[PDB]
Design a protein around this ligand. Structure first.
Ligand code: HEM
Ligand code: QI9
Ligand code: ZN
Ligand code: ZN
Ligand code: ZN
Length: 464
């Protein structure tokens, strides 16, 4: 077929002609259409916009678009054929085994005595207390949200939480957010393109110094956890399930259950689960002080269904359509992963009539789905009625894809939903939130850095 249209590529730079990327892509779509081509660096890229283009690539041709672009520098992090974690794992057996293991482990920990929900519920109480200690004073909520959300992954993975002032916990979070910044920069581009340049210790010890330090701190926690593990008892957490799997797999060089993969898998869940759920909650509180009327309506629904004393539970969610709408609207408007995570074609395919060669990097423009003017009533406004009908029933349109779609769609979504509902409703249950007086109305526009964070703001949290 015909290759997707796009801007004429320069001789050597191509289409290279960061902080404003999601805006630039919205301009190219209106200019060239829902499926267009770019030559970013030395990589051939196809951008997909709208639900139809994204679905066709990820669902209809799901088998041919489930791969990731190779990332040579991950060799520095201990990556190998049977140890690719989940997130950046090439499509194949090493990815599928670990994908099925996390999906299933999350499922099992979410059933029975409901340990995940219990961990989340306790973490919310801790988060509430930490908020109450700021009573009367404006503060940035971001740090505390990070800690609460990081402890939930800590609970999932190592069966413990950490105190909010614990030294190692703090360094761990610090290294994780520094490591995120290392995802951006020209360096990793050149290094992934010309991997032989990695033999220069100057460049190799710089490209992933924070992620490598992040992993070092994790090992120390895994080493401790390995001492306390009781293999005579059912696995309490994901690391123990993994460890048990690793024992059975001793002698099998085909297994992806090994020590090198364990640290990558745990780091993946932290990386994937921290900044997303936290940033989203940070969007949520911002939108609640920018729109206090919505806040009050949520608080009314909370009193009528839950009360001012009892802790929110997940069974409440089905009886709180307005709060559910709002939380979905926080995700849709917040749009925290506008360009998602890159896929690669493992086979020539057809999308919207155009030919996509094998080995093409696909960018799924999720933002273009969440903000589609054809689908949403007022996509650039915060509008909880995007998820309500006239009767007040919660409705989830198909264009709600903040977790992407197909085989690689967020494996964390059920946990994320749980965290968003329990943290959000718990906070609004006990506190009224507002902009501090004599401070400027905070911007509803985010800052892009792969992830989109709300603009820095402070709030007041007043007990109810
Ligand atoms: C508000 C919360 C979250 C959002 C918006 C979000 C969003 C995303 C997106 C866009 C992807 C890429 C899908 C693709 O490649 O097409 C992804 C993948 C992933 N997420 Fe999430 N995520 C969230 C929370 C979490 C949590 C809590 C966990 C873990 C407990 C998690 C674990 C993962 C993993 C492991 C992947 C890689 C899946 C794979 O490649 O097979 N995420 N997420
Ligand atoms: C891309 C895969 C790996 C590289 N980074 C650390 C481990 C893995 C996760 C990712 C980063 O934490 C991260 C978290 C959540 N959403 C992301 C979305 C995009 C991204 O880079 C474009 C990095 C993201
Ligand atoms: Zn344990
Ligand atoms: Zn209805
Ligand atoms: Zn209270």
């Amino acid at each position: 077929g015909k290759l997707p249209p796009g801007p004429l590529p320069l001789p050597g730079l191509g289409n290279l002609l960061f902080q404003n990327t999601p805006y630039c892509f919205d301009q190219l779509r209106r200019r060239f259409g829902d499926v267009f081509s770019l030559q970013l660096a030395w990589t051939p890229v196809v951008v997909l916009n709208g639900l139809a283009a994204v679905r066709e690539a990820l669902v209809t041709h799901g088998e041919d678009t489930a791969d990731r672009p190779p990332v040579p520098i991950t060799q520095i992090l201990g990556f190998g054929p049977r140890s690719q974690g989940v997130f950046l794992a090439r499509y194949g057996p090493a990815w599928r085994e670990q994908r099925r293991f996390s999906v299933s482990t999350l499922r099992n920990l979410g059933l029975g005595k409901k340990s995940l929900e219990q961990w989340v519920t306790e973490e919310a109480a801790c988060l509430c207390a930490a908020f109450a200690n700021h009573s009367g004073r404006p503060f940035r909520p971001n740090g505390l949200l990070d800690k609460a959300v990081s402890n939930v992954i800590a609970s999932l993975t190592c069966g413990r939480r950490f105190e909010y002032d614990d030294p190692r916990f703090l360094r761990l979070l610090d290294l994780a957010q520094e490591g995120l910044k290392e995802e951006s920069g020209f360096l990793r581009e050149v290094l992934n393109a010309v991997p032989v340049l990695l033999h220069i210790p100057a460049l190799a010890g710089k490209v992933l110094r924070f992620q490598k330090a992040f992993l070092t701190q994790l090992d120390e926690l895994l080493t401790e956890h390995r001492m306390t593990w009781d293999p005579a008892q059912p696995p309490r957490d994901l690391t123990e399930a993994f460890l048990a799997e690793m024992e059975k797999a001793k002698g099998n060089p085909e297994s992806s259950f090994n020590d090198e993969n364990l640290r990558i898998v745990v780091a993946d869940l932290f990386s994937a689960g921290m900044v997303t759920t936290s940033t989203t909650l940070a969007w949520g509180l911002l939108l609640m002080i920018l729109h206090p009327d919505v806040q009050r309506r949520v608080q009314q629904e909370i009193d009528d269904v839950i009360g001012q004393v009892r802790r929110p539970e997940m069974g409440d969610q089905a009886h709180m359509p307005y709060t559910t709408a709002v939380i979905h609207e926080v995700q849709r408007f917040g749009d925290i992963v506008p360009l998602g995570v890159t896929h690669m074609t493992s086979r020539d395919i057809e999308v919207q009539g155009f030919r996509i060669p094998k080995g093409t990097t696909l960018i799924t423009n999720l933002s273009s789905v969440l903000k589609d003017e054809a689908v949403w009533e007022k996509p650039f406004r915060f509008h909880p009625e995007h998820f309500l009908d006239a009767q007040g029933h919660f409705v989830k349109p198909e264009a709600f894809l903040p977790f992407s779609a197909g085989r690689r769609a967020c494996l964390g979504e059920p946990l994320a939903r749980m965290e968003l509902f329990l943290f959000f409703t718990s906070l609004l249950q006990h506190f009224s939130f507002s902009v501090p007086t004599g401070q400027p109305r905070p911007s509803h526009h985010g800052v892009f850095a792969f992830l989109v964070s709300p603009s820095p703001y402070e709030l007041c949290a007043v007990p109810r």
